[PDB]
Coordinates of C-alpha atoms and ligand atoms in Angstrom, one line a residue:
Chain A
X1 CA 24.7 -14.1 12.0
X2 CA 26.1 -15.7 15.2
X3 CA 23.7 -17.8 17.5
X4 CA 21.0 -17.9 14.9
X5 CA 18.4 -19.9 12.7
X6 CA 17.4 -20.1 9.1
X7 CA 15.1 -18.1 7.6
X8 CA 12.1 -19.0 5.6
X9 CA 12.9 -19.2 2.2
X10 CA 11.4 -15.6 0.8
X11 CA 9.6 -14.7 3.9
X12 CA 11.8 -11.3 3.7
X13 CA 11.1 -9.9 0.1
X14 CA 13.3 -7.5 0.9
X15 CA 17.1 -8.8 1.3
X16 CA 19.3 -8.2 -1.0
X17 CA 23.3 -9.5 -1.5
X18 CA 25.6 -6.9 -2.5
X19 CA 27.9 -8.7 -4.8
X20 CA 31.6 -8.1 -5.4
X21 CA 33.4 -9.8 -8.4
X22 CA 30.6 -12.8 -7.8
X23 CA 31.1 -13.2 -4.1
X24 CA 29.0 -12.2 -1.3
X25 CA 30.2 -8.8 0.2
X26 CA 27.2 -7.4 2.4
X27 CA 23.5 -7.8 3.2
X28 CA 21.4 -4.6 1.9
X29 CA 17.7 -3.7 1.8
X30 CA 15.2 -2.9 -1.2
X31 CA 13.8 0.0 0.0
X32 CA 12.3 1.1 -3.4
X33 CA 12.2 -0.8 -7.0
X34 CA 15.6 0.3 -8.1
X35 CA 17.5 1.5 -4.9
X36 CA 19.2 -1.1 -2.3
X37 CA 20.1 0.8 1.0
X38 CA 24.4 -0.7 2.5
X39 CA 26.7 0.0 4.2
X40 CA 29.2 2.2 2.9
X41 CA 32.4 0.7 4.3
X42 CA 31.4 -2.5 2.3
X43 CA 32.2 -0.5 -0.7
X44 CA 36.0 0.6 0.3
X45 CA 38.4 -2.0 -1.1
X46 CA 36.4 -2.2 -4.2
X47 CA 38.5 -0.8 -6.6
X48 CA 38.0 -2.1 -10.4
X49 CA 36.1 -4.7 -9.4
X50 CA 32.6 -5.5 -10.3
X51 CA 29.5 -4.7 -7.6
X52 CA 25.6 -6.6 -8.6
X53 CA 22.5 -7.1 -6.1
X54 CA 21.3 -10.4 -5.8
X55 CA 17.4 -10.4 -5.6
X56 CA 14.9 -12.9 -4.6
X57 CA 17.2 -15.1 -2.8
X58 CA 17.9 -17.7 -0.2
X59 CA 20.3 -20.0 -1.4
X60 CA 23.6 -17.7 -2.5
X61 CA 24.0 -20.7 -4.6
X62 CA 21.5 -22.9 -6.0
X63 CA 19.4 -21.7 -8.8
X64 CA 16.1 -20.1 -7.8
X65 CA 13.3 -19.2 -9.7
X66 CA 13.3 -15.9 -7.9
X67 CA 16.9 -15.2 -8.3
X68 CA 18.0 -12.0 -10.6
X69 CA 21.1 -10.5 -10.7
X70 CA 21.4 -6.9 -11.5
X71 CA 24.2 -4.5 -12.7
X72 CA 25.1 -1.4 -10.7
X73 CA 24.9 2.4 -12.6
X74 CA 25.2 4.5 -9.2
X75 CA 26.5 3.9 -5.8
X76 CA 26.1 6.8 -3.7
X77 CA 28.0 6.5 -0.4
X78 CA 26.8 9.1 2.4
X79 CA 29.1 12.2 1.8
X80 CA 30.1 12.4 5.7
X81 CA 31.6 8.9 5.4
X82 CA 34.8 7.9 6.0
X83 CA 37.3 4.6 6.4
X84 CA 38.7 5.3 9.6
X85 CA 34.8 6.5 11.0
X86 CA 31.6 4.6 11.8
X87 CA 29.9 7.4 11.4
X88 CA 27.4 7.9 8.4
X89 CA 28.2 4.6 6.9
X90 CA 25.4 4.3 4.6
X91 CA 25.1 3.7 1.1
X92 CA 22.7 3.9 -1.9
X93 CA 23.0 1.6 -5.1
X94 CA 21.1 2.2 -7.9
X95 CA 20.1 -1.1 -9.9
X96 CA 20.4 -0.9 -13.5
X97 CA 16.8 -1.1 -14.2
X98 CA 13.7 -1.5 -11.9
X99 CA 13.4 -4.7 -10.3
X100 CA 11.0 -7.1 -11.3
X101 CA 8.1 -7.8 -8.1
X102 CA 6.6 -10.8 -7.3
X103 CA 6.1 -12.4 -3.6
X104 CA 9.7 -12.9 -3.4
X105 CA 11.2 -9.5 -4.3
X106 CA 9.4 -6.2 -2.5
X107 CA 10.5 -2.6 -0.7
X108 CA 10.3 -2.2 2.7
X109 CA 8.9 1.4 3.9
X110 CA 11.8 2.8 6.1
X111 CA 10.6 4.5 9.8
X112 CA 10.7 8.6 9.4
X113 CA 9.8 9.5 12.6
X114 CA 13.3 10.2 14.3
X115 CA 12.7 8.8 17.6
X116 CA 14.7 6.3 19.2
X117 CA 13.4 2.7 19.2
X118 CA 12.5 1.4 22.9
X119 CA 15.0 -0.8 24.9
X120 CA 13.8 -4.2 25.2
X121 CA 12.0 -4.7 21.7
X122 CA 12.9 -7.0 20.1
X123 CA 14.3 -6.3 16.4
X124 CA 15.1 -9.3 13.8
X125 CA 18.5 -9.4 11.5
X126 CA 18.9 -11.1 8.7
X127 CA 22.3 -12.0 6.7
X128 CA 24.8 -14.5 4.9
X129 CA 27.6 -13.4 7.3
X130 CA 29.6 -15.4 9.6
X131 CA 27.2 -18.2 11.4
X132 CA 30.6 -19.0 14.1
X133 CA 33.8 -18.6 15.6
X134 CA 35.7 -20.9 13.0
X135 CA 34.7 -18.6 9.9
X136 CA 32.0 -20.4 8.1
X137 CA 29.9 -18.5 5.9
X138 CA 26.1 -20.0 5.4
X139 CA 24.9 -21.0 2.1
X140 CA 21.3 -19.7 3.1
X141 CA 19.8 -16.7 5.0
X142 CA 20.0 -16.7 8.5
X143 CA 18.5 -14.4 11.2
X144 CA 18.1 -13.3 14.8
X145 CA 15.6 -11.6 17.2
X146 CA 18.4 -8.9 19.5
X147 CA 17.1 -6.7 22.2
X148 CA 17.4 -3.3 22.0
X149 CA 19.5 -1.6 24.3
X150 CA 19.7 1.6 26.1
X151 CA 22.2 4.3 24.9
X152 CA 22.8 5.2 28.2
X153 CA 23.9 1.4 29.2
X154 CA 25.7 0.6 25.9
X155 CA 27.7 4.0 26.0
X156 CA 28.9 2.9 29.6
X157 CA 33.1 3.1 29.7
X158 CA 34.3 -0.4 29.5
X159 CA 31.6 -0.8 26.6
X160 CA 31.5 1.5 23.9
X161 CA 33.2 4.2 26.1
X162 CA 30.5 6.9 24.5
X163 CA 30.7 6.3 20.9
X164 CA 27.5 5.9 20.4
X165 CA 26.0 8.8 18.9
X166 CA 22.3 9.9 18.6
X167 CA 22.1 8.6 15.5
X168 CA 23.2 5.1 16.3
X169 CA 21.7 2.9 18.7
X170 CA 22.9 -0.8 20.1
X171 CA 21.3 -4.3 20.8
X172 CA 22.8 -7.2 22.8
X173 CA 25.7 -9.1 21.5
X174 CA 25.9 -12.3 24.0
X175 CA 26.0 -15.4 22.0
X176 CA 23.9 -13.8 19.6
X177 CA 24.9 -11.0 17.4
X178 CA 25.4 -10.2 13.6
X179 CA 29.4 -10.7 12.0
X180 CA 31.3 -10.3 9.1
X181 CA 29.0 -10.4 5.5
X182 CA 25.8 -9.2 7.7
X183 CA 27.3 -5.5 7.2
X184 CA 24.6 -3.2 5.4
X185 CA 21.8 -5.6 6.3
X186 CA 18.5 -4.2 8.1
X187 CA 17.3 -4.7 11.6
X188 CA 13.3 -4.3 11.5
X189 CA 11.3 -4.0 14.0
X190 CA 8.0 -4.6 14.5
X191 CA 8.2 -4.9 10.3
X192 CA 9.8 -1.7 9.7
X193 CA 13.2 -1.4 8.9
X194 CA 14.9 0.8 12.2
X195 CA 18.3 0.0 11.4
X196 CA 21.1 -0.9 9.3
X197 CA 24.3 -3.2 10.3
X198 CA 26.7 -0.9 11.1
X199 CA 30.3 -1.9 9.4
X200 CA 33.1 -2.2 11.2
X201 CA 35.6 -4.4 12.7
X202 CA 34.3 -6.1 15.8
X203 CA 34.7 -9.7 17.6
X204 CA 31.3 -11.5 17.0
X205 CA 28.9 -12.2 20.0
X206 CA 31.2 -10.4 22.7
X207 CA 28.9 -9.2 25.3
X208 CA 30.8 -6.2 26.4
X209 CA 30.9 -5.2 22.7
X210 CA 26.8 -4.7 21.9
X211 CA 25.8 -4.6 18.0
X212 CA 26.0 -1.0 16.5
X213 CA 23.6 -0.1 14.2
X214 CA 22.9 3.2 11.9
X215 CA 19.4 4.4 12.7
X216 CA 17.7 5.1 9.3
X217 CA 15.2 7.6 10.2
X218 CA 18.3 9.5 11.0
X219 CA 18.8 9.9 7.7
X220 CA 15.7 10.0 5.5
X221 CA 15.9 13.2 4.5
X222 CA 19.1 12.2 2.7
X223 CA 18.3 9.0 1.6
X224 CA 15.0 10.7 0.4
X225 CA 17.2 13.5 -1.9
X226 CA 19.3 10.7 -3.5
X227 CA 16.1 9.2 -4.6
X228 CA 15.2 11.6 -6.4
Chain B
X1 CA -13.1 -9.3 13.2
X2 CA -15.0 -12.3 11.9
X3 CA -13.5 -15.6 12.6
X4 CA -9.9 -14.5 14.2
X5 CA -8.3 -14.4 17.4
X6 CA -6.9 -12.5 20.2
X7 CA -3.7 -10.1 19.4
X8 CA -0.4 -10.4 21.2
X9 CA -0.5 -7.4 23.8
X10 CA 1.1 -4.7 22.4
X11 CA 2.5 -6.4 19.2
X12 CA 0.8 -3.7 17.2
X13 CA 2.5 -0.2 18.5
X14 CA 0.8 1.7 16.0
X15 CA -3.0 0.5 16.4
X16 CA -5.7 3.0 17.5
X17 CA -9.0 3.3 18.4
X18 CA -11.1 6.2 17.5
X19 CA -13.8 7.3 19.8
X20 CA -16.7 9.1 19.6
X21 CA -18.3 10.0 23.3
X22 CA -15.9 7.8 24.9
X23 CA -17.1 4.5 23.0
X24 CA -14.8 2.5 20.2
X25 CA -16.3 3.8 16.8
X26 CA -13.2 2.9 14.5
X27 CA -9.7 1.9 14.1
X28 CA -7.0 3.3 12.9
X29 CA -2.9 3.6 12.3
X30 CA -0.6 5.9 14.1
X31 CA 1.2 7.4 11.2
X32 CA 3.3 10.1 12.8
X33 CA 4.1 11.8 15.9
X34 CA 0.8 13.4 15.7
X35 CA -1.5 12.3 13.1
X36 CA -3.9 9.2 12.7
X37 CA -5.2 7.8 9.5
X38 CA -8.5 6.3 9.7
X39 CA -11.8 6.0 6.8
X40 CA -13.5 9.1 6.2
X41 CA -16.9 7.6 6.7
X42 CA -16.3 6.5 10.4
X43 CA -16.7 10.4 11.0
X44 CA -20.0 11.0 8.9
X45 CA -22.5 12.3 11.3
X46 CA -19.8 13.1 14.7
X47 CA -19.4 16.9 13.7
X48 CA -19.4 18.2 17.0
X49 CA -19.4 15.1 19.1
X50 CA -16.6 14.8 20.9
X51 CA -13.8 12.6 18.8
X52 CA -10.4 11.1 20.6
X53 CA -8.2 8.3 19.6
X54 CA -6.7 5.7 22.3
X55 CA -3.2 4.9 22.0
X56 CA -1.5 2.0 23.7
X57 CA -4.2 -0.1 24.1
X58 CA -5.1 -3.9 24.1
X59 CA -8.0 -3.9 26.3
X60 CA -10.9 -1.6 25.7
X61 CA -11.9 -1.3 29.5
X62 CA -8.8 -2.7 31.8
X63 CA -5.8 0.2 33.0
X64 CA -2.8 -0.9 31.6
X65 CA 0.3 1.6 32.2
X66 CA 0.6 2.2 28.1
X67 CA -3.0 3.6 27.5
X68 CA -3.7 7.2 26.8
X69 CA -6.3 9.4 25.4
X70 CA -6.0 12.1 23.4
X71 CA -7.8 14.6 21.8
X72 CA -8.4 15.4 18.4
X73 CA -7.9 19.2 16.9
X74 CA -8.1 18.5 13.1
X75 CA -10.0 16.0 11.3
X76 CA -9.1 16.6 7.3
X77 CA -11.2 14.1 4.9
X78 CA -9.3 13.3 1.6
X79 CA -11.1 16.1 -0.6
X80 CA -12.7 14.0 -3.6
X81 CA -14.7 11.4 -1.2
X82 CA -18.4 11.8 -0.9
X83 CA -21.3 10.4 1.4
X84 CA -22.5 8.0 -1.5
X85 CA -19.0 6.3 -2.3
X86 CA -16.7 3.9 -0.9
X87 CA -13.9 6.0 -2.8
X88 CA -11.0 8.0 -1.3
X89 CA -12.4 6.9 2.2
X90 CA -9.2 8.1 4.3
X91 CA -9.3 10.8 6.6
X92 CA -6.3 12.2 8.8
X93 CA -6.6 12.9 12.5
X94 CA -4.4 15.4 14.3
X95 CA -4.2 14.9 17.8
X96 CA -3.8 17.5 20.7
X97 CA 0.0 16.8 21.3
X98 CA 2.5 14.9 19.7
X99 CA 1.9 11.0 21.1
X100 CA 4.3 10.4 23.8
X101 CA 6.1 6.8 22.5
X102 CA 7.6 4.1 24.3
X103 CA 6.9 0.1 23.4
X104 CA 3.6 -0.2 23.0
X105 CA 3.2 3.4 21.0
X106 CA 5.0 3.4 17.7
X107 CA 4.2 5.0 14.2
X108 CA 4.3 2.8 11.4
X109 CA 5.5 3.8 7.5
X110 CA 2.9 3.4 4.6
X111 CA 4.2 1.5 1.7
X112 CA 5.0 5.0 -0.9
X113 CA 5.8 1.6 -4.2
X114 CA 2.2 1.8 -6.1
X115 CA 2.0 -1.4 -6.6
X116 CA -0.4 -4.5 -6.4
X117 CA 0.2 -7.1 -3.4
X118 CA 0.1 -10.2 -5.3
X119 CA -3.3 -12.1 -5.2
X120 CA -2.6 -15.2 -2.7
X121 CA -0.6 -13.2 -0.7
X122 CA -1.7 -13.3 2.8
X123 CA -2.4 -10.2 5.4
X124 CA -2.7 -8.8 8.9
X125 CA -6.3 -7.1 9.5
X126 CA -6.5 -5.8 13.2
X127 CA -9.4 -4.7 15.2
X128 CA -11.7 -4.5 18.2
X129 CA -15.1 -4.3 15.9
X130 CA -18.0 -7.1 16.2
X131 CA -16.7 -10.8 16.5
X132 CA -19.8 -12.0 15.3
X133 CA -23.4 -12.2 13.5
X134 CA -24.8 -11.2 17.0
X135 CA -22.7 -8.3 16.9
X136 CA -20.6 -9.3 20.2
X137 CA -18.1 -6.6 20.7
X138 CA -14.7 -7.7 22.3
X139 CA -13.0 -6.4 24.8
X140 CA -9.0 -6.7 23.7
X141 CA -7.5 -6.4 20.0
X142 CA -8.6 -9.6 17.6
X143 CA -6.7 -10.1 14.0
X144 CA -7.3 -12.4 10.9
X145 CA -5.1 -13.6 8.3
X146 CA -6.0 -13.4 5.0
X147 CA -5.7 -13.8 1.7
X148 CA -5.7 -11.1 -1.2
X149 CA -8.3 -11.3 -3.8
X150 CA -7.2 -10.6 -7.6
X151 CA -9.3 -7.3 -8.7
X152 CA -10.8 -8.9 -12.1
X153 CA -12.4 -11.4 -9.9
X154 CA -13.6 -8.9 -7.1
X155 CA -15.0 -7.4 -9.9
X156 CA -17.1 -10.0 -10.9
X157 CA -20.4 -9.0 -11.7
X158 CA -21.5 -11.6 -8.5
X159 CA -19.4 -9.8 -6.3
X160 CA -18.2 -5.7 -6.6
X161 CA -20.0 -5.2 -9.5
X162 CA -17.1 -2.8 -11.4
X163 CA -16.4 -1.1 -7.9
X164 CA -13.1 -1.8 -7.2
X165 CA -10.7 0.3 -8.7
X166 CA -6.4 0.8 -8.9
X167 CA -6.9 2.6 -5.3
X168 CA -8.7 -0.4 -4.1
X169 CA -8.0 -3.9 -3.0
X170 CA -9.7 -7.2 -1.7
X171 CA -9.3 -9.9 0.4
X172 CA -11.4 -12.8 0.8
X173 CA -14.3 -13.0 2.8
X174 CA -15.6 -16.9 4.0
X175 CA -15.8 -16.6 7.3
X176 CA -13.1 -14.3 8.2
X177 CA -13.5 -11.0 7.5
X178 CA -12.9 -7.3 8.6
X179 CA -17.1 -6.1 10.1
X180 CA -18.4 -3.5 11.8
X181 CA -16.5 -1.1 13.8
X182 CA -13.0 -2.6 12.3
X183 CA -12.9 0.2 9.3
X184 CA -10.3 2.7 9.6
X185 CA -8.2 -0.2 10.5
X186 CA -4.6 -1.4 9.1
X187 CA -4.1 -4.3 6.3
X188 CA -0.6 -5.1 6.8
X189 CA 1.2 -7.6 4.8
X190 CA 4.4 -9.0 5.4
X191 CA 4.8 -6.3 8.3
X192 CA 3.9 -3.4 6.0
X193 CA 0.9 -1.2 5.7
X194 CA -0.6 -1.6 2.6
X195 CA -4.5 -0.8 2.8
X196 CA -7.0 0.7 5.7
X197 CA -10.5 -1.1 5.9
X198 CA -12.7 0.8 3.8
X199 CA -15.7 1.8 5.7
X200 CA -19.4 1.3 4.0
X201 CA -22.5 -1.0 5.0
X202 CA -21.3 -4.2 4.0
X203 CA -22.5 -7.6 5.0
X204 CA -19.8 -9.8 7.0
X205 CA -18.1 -13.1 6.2
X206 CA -20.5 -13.7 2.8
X207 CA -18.2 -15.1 0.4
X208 CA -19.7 -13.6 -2.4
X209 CA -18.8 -10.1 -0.6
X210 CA -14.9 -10.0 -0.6
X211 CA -13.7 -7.4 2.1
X212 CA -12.5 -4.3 0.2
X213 CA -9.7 -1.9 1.5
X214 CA -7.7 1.1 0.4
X215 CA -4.9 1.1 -1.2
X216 CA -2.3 3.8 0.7
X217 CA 0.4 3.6 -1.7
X218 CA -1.7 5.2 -4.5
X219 CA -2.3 8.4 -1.8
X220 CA 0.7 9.0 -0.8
X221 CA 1.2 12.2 -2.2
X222 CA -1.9 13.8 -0.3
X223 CA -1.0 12.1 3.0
X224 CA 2.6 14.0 2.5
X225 CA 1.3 17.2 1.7
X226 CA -1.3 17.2 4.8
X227 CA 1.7 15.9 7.4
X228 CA 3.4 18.9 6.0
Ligands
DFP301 P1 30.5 -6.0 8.2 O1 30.3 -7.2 7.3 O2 30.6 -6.5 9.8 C1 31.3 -5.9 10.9 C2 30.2 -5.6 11.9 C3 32.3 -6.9 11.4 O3 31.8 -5.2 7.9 C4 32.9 -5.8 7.2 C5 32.7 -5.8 5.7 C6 34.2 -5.1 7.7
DFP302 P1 -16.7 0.1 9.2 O1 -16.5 -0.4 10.6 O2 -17.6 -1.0 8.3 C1 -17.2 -2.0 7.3 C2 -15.9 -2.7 7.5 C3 -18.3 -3.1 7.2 O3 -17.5 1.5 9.2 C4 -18.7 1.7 10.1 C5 -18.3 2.5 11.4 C6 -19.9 2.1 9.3

């Protein structure tokens, strides 16, 4: 997260680190006890190696009584996916056993009505991406409150020249925004989750480059068939 | 709302009011394009009386550009509740025409995890029912924090004498507290629903009489099958 703060230790139940080979690889979200919601480009250069989901954390390193790693038996990227795309990028990761509760480690209810949010409002990102320019990854959770901007506006030419679909939406990148390792993270508003960090390769906190970001309701019917 | 204070504006998107004759009778949670949840017992002698629920609203009795009235067609009780019984006490509202949305008009996602909110925990109860013993009724949206009782002890035999059940809940009641005209209402916690006030004659702010409040998660199934 560029242009952020820190986060309250457990204050979001709900974040989750999708792990590759023991390293931090994406943010996701607990949306049910054994089912973390990605990005699906975060998955690509996986290969042989090892995915886990951190749970209960703030500190990617220190021990936490909250902290519990847990094994991988599914990941189900969206079947419209692909590498060179930004389309569909979603992904569903099925724990290895339910997750263990407490006030550190909880779902959080997706929106299902498929209407766009309203520009202006305020959502909140979290992540353990990028905090600046130089490359330096956080050792705890950071987050931002972004703006919501209006398709019409973000799809203008010398911004994302039309790109953004109906089933994406953008908030304000100037000096504020969400980078590398904040892919497959959630942007809630209002306390429900709207959004996911869209993954892709993109210059941090360029204003005439708004935040893309996948529009879960968009999808809950799929999301809602995998679960099942 | 015993012991709280005012609400930010429109911070609460999903909030309603249910009326009956054009006067505040309940609250309740926009749900869905076109359905309100509220307590089935808010609606016990209405019948024919003329029921709406105001969306977008902060202040009972000043025009701001986000209110709007609308009228009810359906009113479906949950099947097993009865006069004589704070049990299944939820009641879905369909209104005349899907609820135009914008910033201060939002539906909001019911936790669909059965599972207890840890005692301690601390929630969101919103309303615009009696502020005090003298029954003062405010004129904008009030809100408490508090915490969650464990059920063994809001079962005490001093307090809900074996009432409380796996659909239920409590909260603590010393001087904060959810009263009169605040049932139907949302108990969000950590920005996501988790109960509706239960409606029932109930003194306010006793601390031997915990607040009680139904548990959405564990009705989930009928709520879908209704919207549907
Ligand atoms: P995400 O972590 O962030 C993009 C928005 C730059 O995707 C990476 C893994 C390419
Ligand atoms: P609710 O407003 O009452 C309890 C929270 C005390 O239901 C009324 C309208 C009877």
């Amino acid at each position: 997260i560029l242009g952020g703060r820190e986060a309250e230790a457990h204050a979001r139940p709900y974040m989750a680190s999708v792990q590759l080979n023991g390293a931090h690889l994406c943010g996701g979200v607990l949306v049910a006890e054994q089912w973390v919601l990605s990005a699906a480009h975060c998955l690509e250069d996986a290969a042989d190696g090892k995915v886990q989901v951190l749970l209960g954390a703030h500190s990617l390193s220190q021990p936490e009584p909250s902290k519990r790693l847990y094994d991988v038996l599914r990941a189900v990227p969206h079947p419209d996916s692909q590498p060179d795309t930004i389309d569909h990028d979603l992904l569903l990761l099925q724990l290895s056993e339910k997750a263990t509760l407490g006030p550190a480690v909880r779902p959080l209810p997706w929106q299902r009505v498929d209407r766009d949010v309203a520009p202006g409002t305020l959502c909140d990102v979290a992540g353990w991406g990028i905090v600046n320019h130089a490359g330096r990854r956080p050792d705890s959770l950071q987050h931002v409150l972004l703006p919501v901007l209006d398709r019409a506006t973000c799809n203008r030419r010398t911004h994302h020249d039309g790109a953004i679909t109906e089933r994406l939406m953008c908030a304000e990148s100037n000096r504020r925004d969400s980078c590398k390792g904040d892919s497959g993270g959630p942007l809630v508003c209002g306390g429900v989750l709207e959004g996911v960090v869209t993954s892709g390769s993109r210059v941090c906190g360029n204003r005439k480059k708004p935040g893309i970001y996948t529009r879960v309701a968009s999808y809950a019917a799929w999301i809602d068939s995998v679960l099942a």
